[PDB]
Assembly symmetry: C3
Homo-oligomer: 33 residues x 3
């Protein structure tokens, strides 16, 4: 159970990081995004 | 404890999915968004 | 293990909340964002 929750949490960390990069690019207009 | 953390994690999965849909719509201009 | 996962999950909750605020501001044009 705990090891599987570790997996889900790390998967969420990656998804959140990807969202952060995309949202920062939209906010700041990076490379015309 | 573990069952409650499962709940928090699934709640985060849904919030992240909703954010992904919204960010993809902004990036791609879906339906004029 | 469990206490550390609680920490990671709450950190994700804060990151997701910040993303939600930023995405809602982009969607709605709050304050010219």
């Amino acid at each position: 159970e705990v090891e599987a929750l570790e997996k889900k949490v790390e998967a969420l960390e990656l998804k959140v990081q990807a969202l952060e990069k995309k949202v920062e690019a939209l906010e700041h207009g990076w490379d015309g995004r």
